[PDB]
Each structure stands twice: as structure tokens, then as C-alpha cells.
Nucleic acid binder design. Structure first.
Ligand SMILES: [Br-]
Ligand SMILES: [Br-]
Ligand SMILES: [Br-]
Ligand SMILES: [Br-]
Ligand SMILES: [Br-]
Ligand SMILES: [Mg+2]
Lengths: 251, 213, 300, 223, 242
RNA sequence: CCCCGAGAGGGGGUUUUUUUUUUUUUUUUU
């Protein structure tokens, strides 16, 4: 019942200054507009619950503009509600080969909050301005509204980067992300980052019969290092900011 | 701790340790600071007492007007044995009633006679104890008042017997104060006789002190 | 005590000026005085200035033992003893007067009771040894606004103060001097700021009790002259988290509830500017001490 | 002896000052002559209300001694017979100790004397003469006499001294020794060597004070 | 975190009341005729308050005398047996109590016509026999009643009330248990008006909830005024009829 | 202004306190 009354036909307002939309959401004026940006999501094949979304542009001053966009779950789950209560209780959603026990309802996690492509979605965006050596010059945090250009798969994203046939603005940004990913991963390891390993097997259930028959191994593509490096970068900047604001109760 | 005294560190804890009928001494007028003073020392059995009395008056009272004088008595704890402030106040009240029957207040209009009794050294050597100190207080105050030159109807003295204290005047004919804690039942007559004997002895020594000294 | 004589002419003039949207210092009714914060050489030394109003706060701490009731919490006290230095109107050591006890209680409910300071982080060894933080406010010069000035002085001091670092070997406390290792800052849960409103009745009492249209005047952060001619006081404490820490309208001129709410919202805009201001002056002070530390090591 | 002082910094007081020596900073205020309380009244002379506030904590018996010694200096300085049955409030707020207050009160006392004098000058109260106070100390091994010692020097001292002299004739003639507070182990030879060097640095201080007073007050007056 | 049902889903509280119900309110006038010019015995819940008004009369010291108005004094005696756990120390000189006394004076200085009683003194003695939340509001009602009994002129009633805020649920007239589990707001409303003589918030309250809490308190205080007025007219009729 | 007297005399106009359901691997996307 704590879910939006609209349901699956919920939609971000076309205009962020519309009288009706502002009347219902007075915080909408603080919402930035990044629907002009080229956002894409790199997640596993059968991923419907998308949390992150990336983009990259080259600023006229030679520096790069990197933006990590995270699902705006806070806008839907409010403290005190039973939805928030159950969310805190579960703590996290468990992942099995069989099923997938969600922390939040399907309508919220696999649709509304999910940064699906081709649709306007609310998001909490973190935008950096960094040089070619991946050094942060400045960082800004802002709640925004985006529209994902395409929801890539890890194998699909890697092929589009390598083929060299597609040189569209999106792919050019994806390669820029990977190039900056190498720089960030380099500096991090030099700083003393660990490189542990435990690539567990993936149960390839026979999609022609019923019972599982094949056991393979998941391979780490360069796109996995792309996403990992920018997720870490996002978490670090946020950690510094929230601790500066709340030095005594920072999660 | 206190901003007016030096009581030392707060984490400090006080040191706790493990396990004739009466002999009198009287002196008067040794305190130049006041109008009258007395030193009363008594030694008997397993308890000795050395207390000092000091009379300040008659001095000014800047409030309304009174045809007679106003007496105040305050007992102070000494160095050794301590007593409850309540208990010292109670004895003070009991002493005020006594000397309001003896002091010729009519001779001191709009004046104040403040009597201080310092329980300087009260040793308890037994290897409500305040009842045994009362007769010595009355003796000190009487000596101090007489030494001060304050008019008295008669030499007020007292005695103590089994927690019962009674002060006499007029050769023991009448009573100016009666005090009784603990004790036994129907022992009034015995106490009156024993205290009158102490009263008589104390009065003789007091007169002997006020004259010869 | 020693009184301040106010003529009928002065009473009528200042009140009539308010009726014409005029206050003597030239401020606005909703205008808070410019707050100047100066840090001394030592940590915990802060000087707050609002116009002519001058207050000085000093934060200090010493090793002490916690109460039996609270073995995990440290000790924290706030002193605000007045002196004739702020004016002969104040009696030396008068800590029971109406205005004194109020001010003392406002600060206490704003900082102590509110839990602005993390007293749990003042504990060294539970039920044995802890830090005892002391905030001493010195009222140098009075031109009104002593509550607001004190609350800023205490908070700026607590956020600027740093206690000596401590390593613990069981019950053996190794107190590192500032020469050995750097001192450690205090834990601040929130930053409470006080804003005081002064009320004036331009008419008579009858029109205040039974009058239809309300006409009572309210000004923010009154000076001494405005403070001596007011009919009611309101002190509201908030923080950047948009929450009311405490509100105290202890009697005085009866005031409309909606007007009191308006004051709380007006005060929130002020406490936001003040809080950010304090933080900036703390950063620059830190940058100044570090730049000198670099120029001292380079020359060394 | 590189002290620094300001005059007339407080608004709601007849006179005020802020004296600073090294790390010792004291602000003082003076109101008077004004109406005295009945218990303060002196039939023929001026009554002095002297208050000393510590840098940390509340006023204790320690500051009560600072008030008493400061009284011994200020009392003969003021022409008290000019103000019969009248009061003069003198308040000192020590802002910074400049010394280990748990061990010493030397620098705070000298700074209070100098500040109180300056505040009396600012307030325009009848003074019989001028005055200056300096703290002196004698070190352990070297046994040298250090005028205006630092906090670190005090820690390793054998004796601590407060010297306040009364000057007349343009700050050249020592009228009297208002206060000499010597504490610790010392001999007669050390005492007079202290008094000889102490008088020199005191005379230098008065000259500096006279400069400060004229620099601040002259712009207020007319030519 | 409270394990007790402060406000059940059934809309019921620990004592049985709903969110907008006052406690048992019983006033009493002229309780101590031989001890004061005016007197009132207040029972608001488990709260028990004796209020004595002595005056207007001659000041005991001519030093403390105003020739333009009467001197108003209030002394609150919170007895050591007011709570469940007996307090060892006295509260006579407690800074919390001095503020309460000061607060009450500042309230009635602008209500009691002190100007028509120059060169006199009005002494208000209060004894709190039992305490159970909202003691400040009960103190206000006790003084207002006692002052009226003394025939001392005032412009209007001053009714006191406390309102708690349990997360989002406002609770009118809080007891000790509720005050320990949430922030409360104490109001002092003048007559039937919207004007507050006393606004007291000592614990944290969101800025958005404060206006609504005030609205609840003012409405509740008006009911307290009606009960005070009702009981007063009743006593008036029983006396004027003889 | 008020009180007093056959004759413009006198008296007053007030001075620190209701806060505690404890357990075995890094990171990223799921
Ligand atoms: Br679901
Ligand atoms: Br699209
Ligand atoms: Br001590
Ligand atoms: Br604790
Ligand atoms: Br002004
Ligand atoms: Mg993702």
C-alpha cells in the first residue's frame, strides 16, 4: 500500500516546473535534468533490477566529465512506513541460482526505481570532473532525472567496444570509461589495493530439460573492471561527503 | 569541590581505622575578641570534654524596636567528635529557653547578646552522647555571661543522670529546663536528686571561679 | 540592585520608532547582527562579537571519574557567571537572578540537554576515568543578545577545541602531550544555534487581551536599549537538520501562536547562515594553522 | 618587555583596557566614582570593589588572593579622599594564563596590575602617581635572574617574584615599592640584585606605558 | 524504542484515553481560608497541587516596595514525595525550579493588574503533593484559580496544557510515562484567544510538526478554561445564594 | 490635590536522574 497509486504506469514528469508536478512534489525544483546525457547500464543478461548507470563526456577544457547514476530508491521508500520497515528487516536481497528474494517489491525494484532503458527514471547522480590521468578536480552530488540509452550486457558491452565498427557518441564514451577505468585501477593498486580472488562456478541449468546438467565458470571481462572502478569511486566520494555532514552517525 | 575552601582532591577517601565523680577545670576571660568567655574542662571515666564559650553583646540590632534584649545561642562542632547539625540546633534551643529565664533582658533594650559555645575537644574513650555535654555548656555560658557583665537572676547550673538533664536555679528549688532521652521508667525522682547534687557542685565551683580568679 | 533609569521620552521615542519601522541601530526587524568569530592561539579559545556585544568562551578538560549512575559518560558543564565588566547593572556572582537563571537554563537546554556534545566519547575507561569538558563563558560587554552570543561562543569553542590524544594500557592512561602526538577533536552530534525575539506592545494591555486585530511588534536580536523596553521575550533554538532544539517563551507579552511559528521559520534562515559561517571560519583557521606548520617545518 | 596594550575597548564601562605580555592576556574594566552599597560605604574615602576572574573555571580562593594583592597596589595609587562615600568597581577578566595556573599565578598578577592601572587612567580617576609591574624568576642550575619569564622558564625555576613600583616625576623617580611578592628559595644577595634589575625593567615599562597612554588618549582630547 | 503500546493501532493509550482526551480535571476553590486570601486545590490526573495567594498586603521590607505597582512573588515547592522515587535532595534552590517560578511570574505580570495595587505585595505559595506529567500546565491552572478566589483583578484566564508528539501522533495532556517516551510542548493560553502567554519546548521537535502541536494544545487549553470557568460559576452560585 | 482652624496659619500628597533479545572469508555487477 506504500507503493505509488499509479502502479506500473508511473512516469517522471515531462516538465520539472509543471504546476501539478511541483504541487505534488515541492522538491522537484531541486531535481537536476540529465536526460540529455548518454546513460547506459552494464549488467548481467537476465538483470531486470538495475542499480547503476554510467556516462562520459569530454569537457572543452580537456578534462573528462564522468557521471555515475544510482537508482533513487529514497524517493519511494520513506522512513516509518511498513515498506521501509520490511526493507530494513531484510537488510539485503539474497541471490540464488534458483530464485531471487527481493528486498523491495517487484513493482519498485524491477520497474520504477530500476534504471531501465528508453524511460525517464529518477536517480541520485554523482558527477566528477577529472583529467586524463583520472585525478579528481571536483565532485558534485545531485538528485536528477535520466533516461538510459541502452541496457547492455557484460558480453554485449565488450563486443561493442572492441568491434571498432561502431563509433557513435555512446560507444566513444564507453571506451573513455574503460580508459579511465584502467587509470583508476592502476593508481589504486599502486596505493596498495588488494587483488583477492574467488570466481565461483555458475550452474548452467539445462534450458531444454529440467534438472541442472552443466557447470561452467564466469569469466571476468574488461567491462566488469569498468563498472567496478566507477562504483568504488562513487562509494568513496559519497562516504567522504556524508561523513563531513554527519561525523557521528554516518553509515 | 568547594570554591571557598581547599578540600583537596575528590578521589581521596578519608582514613578509616581497623580494630571522684567528676574532675573539673574552670577559666574565664581569656578571649579579648569578645565581652565574655569561659573554658570548661571535665574528665571522668572514659570520656573527657573541653569546650569554650564566648559571649558577644550587648550589640546593635537594627530591626524595629524591643524593650528587652534578644539572646542567640549557637553550638559549633570541634575538632574531634562531630554531632548532627539538628542535634546541635536542638540543644541550642534548649539552652535559649534556660537563659531566657536567667538573663535580666530588661536591662538591654534593642540589644543583642550572641552566645557561642565551641565544642572544641570531646574525646570518647570507650575504647545520644550530647546529653552528657549539656550541663557543661550551661556552666560555660553562665561563666561567660557573668564574665561579660550580663545581669543574671541566679547562677544557672545543671546535672545529668541516665540520659536525663535538668537545670536548676534558686538553690535547686526550681527548674529552668528539663531534658530526657532514653533512660528508664519512673526514674524521675532519682534523676532530680542526682542532678541537683551535680548542680550544687558546679555552682560552688563557678562562684569560686568568678570570685578568686 | 543598581538600576538603569529610562526616561519617558526615551521609552516613547524608541517605541514610536518601531511603529514607523525604525530601529536605532538602523537594522531591520528581521535582521540579525553580524556575528564575528575570532579564535585564539590555543584550541577552545573563541571570541564572539555581535555589534557592541562581546563574549568570550574557553573550553577546557581534565581527567576525572564519571558518576556512578553513568559509568560510560564523561562530564560536561557550562559556566556563565556575570560580572560588573559587562555593566554595573549586573551584580558580581548573581547566579539566582531572573534573567541570569533563564539564560543559564537556555544554554543548558540548547547544548547540554540537547546532546550537542558526544559525552559517550568522553569516556576513557568505563566507570573509572573519563574526560571532564568545561565551557566557560565570559561576558565582556553587554549590548543585548547574550543568549545568542553565548550559544555561538560555546558551540564554536567545542568545535574548535582539541583534547590530548590518549593510548590506554588497561587502566594505565598514557596522556600524549601536544609535542608528541596531535590532539583529538570533540564529537559534535549537532550544531544548536539560538535566535532571540523581542516583543513590543504599541498599544495597551486591553487591546492585547481582547483586541481583535493583532498589532504587537517583534524584532530579532535586540540591543540593550530595545531589550530594556520590550514586553516579552522568545528564544528559539534550531539546527541545520530543520528541527527545533528548544523553545522558551517564559511568560511576558501574550503573543499570537502563528506569529511565534513565523519567528521559528525566520530563525531557521538565520541559523543556517550562522552554522555555515562557523564551519567556514573553522576551515580557514585549520588552513591557517597548517600553513604555518609547513612554514615552521620548512624553516626548521 | 615587548608588551602590547589597548585602551577604551568597552562601551558600558567608565574605563577599560587590554594588557598583553607574551601569552598572558588580561582585560580590565573600571566604573567609578558611583553610588556604593551600604556595607561598602566609607565616610571619607573611596571604596574599591576588586574582582578577578580566572581564564578557566570559576573564581576560587586562588583569585581571592589575586584580588587581595591587586588591592595592595591600587589602594595607595588612587587619591581616595577625592571621593568620599563613593564606589569604584574594578574587574579583571584573565583571558589567557600564559603559565601553568596549577603551579604559578605570577604573570597573571603582574598583567592584572598593569591592566588595572591602564583602566583607571582611561576612566579618569584621581591617581597620586604612576605604576608598573613585572614578573621575575630565578632558574635552577644557572641561577640567573630572568625578567618577564616564559611558562617553560617558570617550570624550571627556584623562585618566582612579582614587583610593582610607584613612579613619579615623568617615570624617573621610584616613590615606593607598592608590592613585592617573593616566593621560593632565595638569599639576601639575590633579593637586592633582583630589586636592582627589577627597578630598571620597571622604569622601562612605565616609559612604554606612558607612550601607550598618550597615543590612545590624545586623539580624544582637543588642542 | 518502547516495548509498551504508547499508542495502539486501536487508537488507545496506556491509561485508556484517546489521542485528544484530557485527564480527570477537578478544581477546588477556597480550600485554605485561614491561611491565604485566595486558595485552590488542583487535581489534574494524578497531579495534586495546593496553591495559596497571600495578598495584596504590606511588604515585610520597605526596601522592596514599588509605588507604581504590586510586587508579585511565586515559590513552587515540589515535595520530595511528589514522584514514585523519593528525591534525596531538596528542589528549593534548584535552577529548574527558579526558572519555573520566574516563568510563572513573567506570565501573570501581564495579566494581573498590579498597577491598581501600588505599595503592596502579592505572595503566591505553591505545594506540589503529587506529580504525573504536565506539572507546568497544572501549575498555571492552580495560580489562575487561586488568584481569582483572592478577588485580585486580572484581564483573563490563563489555561495551561501539555502536548506530546509520538513520532507523528499528537497526544493531548501527557502523563509521566508519555513524557519519558516522547517530546512534549507546554502551552499557556490566554482566555479563549489564540495568544500564548507561555510556549515551552524542552526536547527535540521537527519544525513541520510544531504548528500542528500548537493547534492541538490551544484547543485543549480552551477546554481547560471552560472547566475552570464552569467550576468557578458553580462555586459562585453556591456562595452568592448562601 | 487632600485634611485641620471665627481672621491667607498649620498638617499631609506614602521608599547529570524512569536509555541495554548476546554467535565462524575482500571487492564489483546480479
Ligand atoms: Br513483489
Ligand atoms: Br532512449
Ligand atoms: Br583544593
Ligand atoms: Br553511561
Ligand atoms: Br541601540
Ligand atoms: Mg548495475
Amino acid at each position: 500500500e506504500c507503493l505509488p497509486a499509479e502502479g506500473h504506469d508511473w512516469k517522471a514528469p515531462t516538465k520539472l516546473d509543471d504546476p501539478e508536478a511541483v504541487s505534488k512534489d515541492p522538491l522537484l525544483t531541486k531535481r537536476k535534468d540529465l536526460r540529455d546525457k548518454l546513460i547506459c547500464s552494464i549488467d548481467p543478461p537476465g538483470c531486470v533490477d538495475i542499480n547503476d548507470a554510467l556516462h562520459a563526456k569530454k569537457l572543452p577544457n580537456g578534462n573528462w566529465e564522468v557521471g555515475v547514476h544510482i537508482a533513487d530508491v529514497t524517493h519511494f521508500v520513506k522512513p516509518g512506513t511498513a515498506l521501509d520497515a520490511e526493507g530494513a528487516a531484510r537488510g539485503t536481497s539474497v541471490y540464488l541460482v534458483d530464485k531471487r528474494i527481493d528486498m523491495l517489491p517487484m513493482l519498485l525494484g524491477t520497474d520504477l526505481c530500476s534504471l531501465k532503458p528508453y524511460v525517464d527514471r529518477f536517480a541520485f547522480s554523482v558527477i566528477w570532473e577529472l583529467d586524463d590521468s583520472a585525478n579528481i578536480v571536483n565532485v558534485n552530488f545531485m538528485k536528477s532525472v535520466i533516461r538510459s540509452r541502452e541496457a547492455f550486457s557484460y558480453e554485449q558491452a565488450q563486443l561493442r567496444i572492441d568491434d571498432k565498427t561502431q563509433n557513435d557518441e555512446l560507444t566513444m564514451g564507453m571506451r573513455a570509461l574503460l580508459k579511465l577505468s584502467v587509470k583508476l585501477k592502476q593508481k589504486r593498486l599502486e596505493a596498495g589495493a588488494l587483488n583477492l580472488a574467488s570466481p565461483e562456478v555458475k550452474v548452467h541449468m539445462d534450458s531444454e530439460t529440467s534438472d541442472p546438467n552443466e557447470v561452467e565458470i564466469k569469466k571476468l571481462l574488461a567491462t566488469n573492471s569498468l563498472v567496478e572502478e566507477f562504483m568504488l569511486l562513487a562509494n568513496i566520494s559519497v562516504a567522504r561527503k556524508i561523513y563531513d555532514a554527519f561525523p557521528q552517525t554516518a553509515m | 569541590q568547594d570554591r571557598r575552601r581547599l578540600l583537596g582532591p575528590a578521589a581521596a577517601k578519608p582514613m578509616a581505622f581497623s580494630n571522684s565523680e567528676q574532675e573539673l577545670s574552670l577559666h574565664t576571660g581569656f578571649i579579648e575578641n569578645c565581652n565574655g568567655s569561659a573554658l570548661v574542662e571535665a574528665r571522668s571515666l572514659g570520656h573527657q570534654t573541653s569546650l569554650i564559650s564566648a559571649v558577644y553583646g550587648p550589640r546593635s540590632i537594627r530591626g524595629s524596636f524591643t524593650s528587652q534584649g534578644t539572646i542567640s545561642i549557637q553550638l559549633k562542632n570541634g575538632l574531634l567528635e562531630k554531632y548532627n547539625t539538628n542535634e546541635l540546633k536542638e540543644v541550642s534551643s534548649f539552652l535559649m529557653g534556660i537563659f531566657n529565664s536567667v538573663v535580666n533582658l530588661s536591662r538591654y533594650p534593642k540589644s543583642g547578646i550572641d552566645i557561642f559555645v565551641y565544642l572544641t575537644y570531646d574525646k570518647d574513650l570507650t575504647n545520644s552522647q550530647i546529653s552528657s555535654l549539656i550541663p557543661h555548656c550551661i556552666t560555660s555560658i553562665t561563666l561567660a555571661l557573668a564574665d561579660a557583665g550580663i545581669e543574671l537572676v541566679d547562677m544557672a547550673g545543671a546535672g545529668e543522670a541516665n540520659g536525663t538533664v535538668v537545670s536548676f536555679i534558686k538553690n535547686g528549688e526550681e527548674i529552668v529546663g528539663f531534658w530526657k532521652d532514653d533512660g528508664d521508667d519512673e526514674d524521675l525522682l532519682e534523676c532530680l536528686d542526682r542532678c541537683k547534687e551535680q548542680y550544687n557542685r558546679y555552682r560552688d565551683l563557678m562562684i569560686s571561679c568568678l570570685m578568686n580568679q | 540592585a543598581k538600576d538603569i533609569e529610562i526616561s519617558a521620552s526615551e521609552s516613547k521615542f524608541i517605541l514610536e520608532a518601531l511603529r514607523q519601522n525604525y530601529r536605532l541601530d538602523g537594522r531591520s526587524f528581521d535582521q540579525f547582527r553580524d556575528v564575528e568569530i575570532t579564535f585564539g592561539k590555543e584550541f577552545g579559545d573563541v571570541s564572539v562579537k555581535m555589534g557592541n556585544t562581546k563574549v568570550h568562551c574557553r573550553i577546557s578538560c581534565q581527567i576525572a571519574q564519571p558518576y556512578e549512575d553513568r559509568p560510560f559518560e564523561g562530564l560536561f558543564v557550562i559556566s556563565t557567571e556575570i560580572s560588573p565588566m559587562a555593566g554595573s547593572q549586573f551584580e558580581n556572582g548573581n547566579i539566582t537572578g531572573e534573567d541570569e537563571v533563564l539564560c543559564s537554563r537556555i544554554i543548558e537546554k540548547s547544548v547540554r540537554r540537547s546532546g550537542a556534545l558526544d559525552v559517550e566519547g568522553l569516556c576513557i575507561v568505563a566507570g573509572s576515568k573519563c574526560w571532564a569538558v568545561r565551557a566557560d563563558v565570559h561576558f565582556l560587554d553587554c549590548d543585548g543578545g547574550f543568549i545568542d552570543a553565548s550559544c555561538i561562543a560555546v558551540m564554536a569553542g567545542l568545535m574548535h577545541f582539541k583534547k590530548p590524544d590518549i593510548t590506554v594500557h588497561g587502566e594505565q592512561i598514557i596522556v600524549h602531550p601536544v609535542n608528541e602526538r596531535e590532539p583529538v577533536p570533540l564529537g559534535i552530534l549537532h550544531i544548536p544555534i539560538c535566535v532571540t525575539f523581542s516583543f513590543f506592545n504599541p498599544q495597551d494591555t486591553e487591546e492585547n487581551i481582547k483586541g481583535e486585530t493583532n498589532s504587537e511588534i517583534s524584532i530579532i536580536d535586540a540591543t540593550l536599549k530595545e531589550e530594556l523596553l520590550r514586553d516579552g521575550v522568545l528564544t528559539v533554538t534550531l539546527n541545520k537538520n530543520r528541527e527545533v532544539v528548544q523553545v522558551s517563551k517564559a511568560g511576558g507579552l501574550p503573543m499570537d501562536a502563528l506569529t511565534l511559528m513565523k519567528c521559528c521559520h525566520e530563525a531557521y534562515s538565520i541559523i543556517e547562515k550562522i552554522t555555515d559561517q562557523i564551519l567556514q571560519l573553522l576551515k580557514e583557521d585549520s588552513e591557517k594553522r597548517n600553513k604555518y606548520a609547513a612554514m615552521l617545518t620548512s624553516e626548521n | 618587555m615587548s608588551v602590547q596594550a589597548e585602551i577604551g575597548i568597552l562601551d558600558h564601562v567608565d574605563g577599560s583596557s587590554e594588557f598583553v605580555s607574551q601569552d598572558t592576556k588580561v582585560i580590565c574594566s573600571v566604573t567609578g566614582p558611583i553610588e556604593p552599597k551600604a556595607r561598602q560605604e566609607l565616610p571619607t574615602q573611596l571604596a574599591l570593589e576588586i574582582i578577578v576572574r580566572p581564564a578557566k573555571g570559576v573564581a576560587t580562593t586562588r583569585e581571592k588572593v589575586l584580588e587581595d594583592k591587586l588591592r595592595a597596589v591600587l589602594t595607595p595609587l588612587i587619591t581616595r579622599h577625592c571621593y568620599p562615600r563613593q564606589l569604584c568597581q574594578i574587574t579583571c577578566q584573565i583571558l589567557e594564563s600564559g603559565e601553568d595556573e596549577a603551579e604559578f599565578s605570577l604573570r597573571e598578577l603582574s598583567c592584572c596590575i598593569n591592566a588595572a592601572f591602564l583602566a583607571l587612567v582611561d576612566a579618569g580617576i584621581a591617581l597620586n602617581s604612576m605604576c608598573a609591574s613585572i614578573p621575575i624568576a630565578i632558574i635552577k642550575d644557572t641561577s640567573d635572574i630572568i625578567v618577564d619569564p616564559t611558562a617553560e622558564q617558570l617550570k624550571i625555576s627556584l623562585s618566582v617574584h612579582t614587583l610593582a613600583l610607584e613612579f613619579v616625576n615623568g617615570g624617573k623617580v621610584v616613590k615606593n615599592v607598592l608590592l613585592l611578592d617573593s616566593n621560593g628559595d632565595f638569599n639576601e644577595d639575590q633579593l637586592f640584585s633582583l630589586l636592582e634589575l627589577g627597578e630598571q625593567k620597571c622604569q622601562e615599562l612605565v616609559t612604554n606605558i606612558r607612550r601607550i597612554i598618550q597615543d590612545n588618549i590624545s586623539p580624544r582630547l582637543v588642542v | 524504542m518502547s516495548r509498551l503500546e504508547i499508542y495502539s493501532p486501536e487508537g488507545l493509550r496506556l491509561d485508556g484515553r484517546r489521542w485528544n482526551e484530557l485527564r480527570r480535571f477537578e478544581s477546588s476553590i477556597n480550600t485554605h481560608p485561614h491561611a491565604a486570601d485566595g486558595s485552590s486545590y488542583m487535581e489534574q490526573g494524578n497531579n495534586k497541587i495546593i496553591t495559596l495567594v497571600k495578598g495584596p498586603k504590606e511588604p515585610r521590607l520597605k526596601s522592596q516596595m514599588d509605588t507604581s505597582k504590586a510586587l508579585l512573588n511565586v515559590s513552587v515547592n515540589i515535595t520530595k514525595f511528589s514522584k514514585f522515587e523519593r528525591s534525596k535532595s531538596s528542589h528549593k534552590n534548584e535552577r529548574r525550579v527558579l526558572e519555573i517560578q520566574t516563568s510563572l511570574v513573567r506570565m501573570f505580570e501581564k495579566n494581573v493588574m498590579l498597577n491598581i495595587y501600588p505599595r503592596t505585595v502579592i505572595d503566591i505559595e505553591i505545594h506540589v503533593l503529587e506529580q504525573d506529567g504536565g506539572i507546568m500546565g497544572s501549575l498555571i491552572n492552580g495560580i489562575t484559580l487561586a488568584l481569582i478566589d483572592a478577588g485580585i483583578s486580572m484581564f483573563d484566564y490563563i489555561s495551561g496544557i501539555s502536548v506530546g508528539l509520538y513520532d507523528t501522533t499528537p497526544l493531548l495532556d501527557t502523563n509521566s510515562l508519555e513524557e519519558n517516551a516522547m517530546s512534549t510542548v507546554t502551552l499557556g493560553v490566554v482566555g479563549k484567544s489564540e495568544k500564548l502567554s507561555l510556549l515551552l519546548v524542552e526536547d527535540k521537535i521537527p519544525l513541520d510538526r510544531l504548528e500542528n502541536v500548537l493547534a492541538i494544545g490551544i484547543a485543549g487549553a480552551h477546554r481547560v478554561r471552560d472547566l475552570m470557568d464552569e467550576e468557578l460559576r458553580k462555586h459562585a452560585q453556591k456562595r452568592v445564594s448562601n
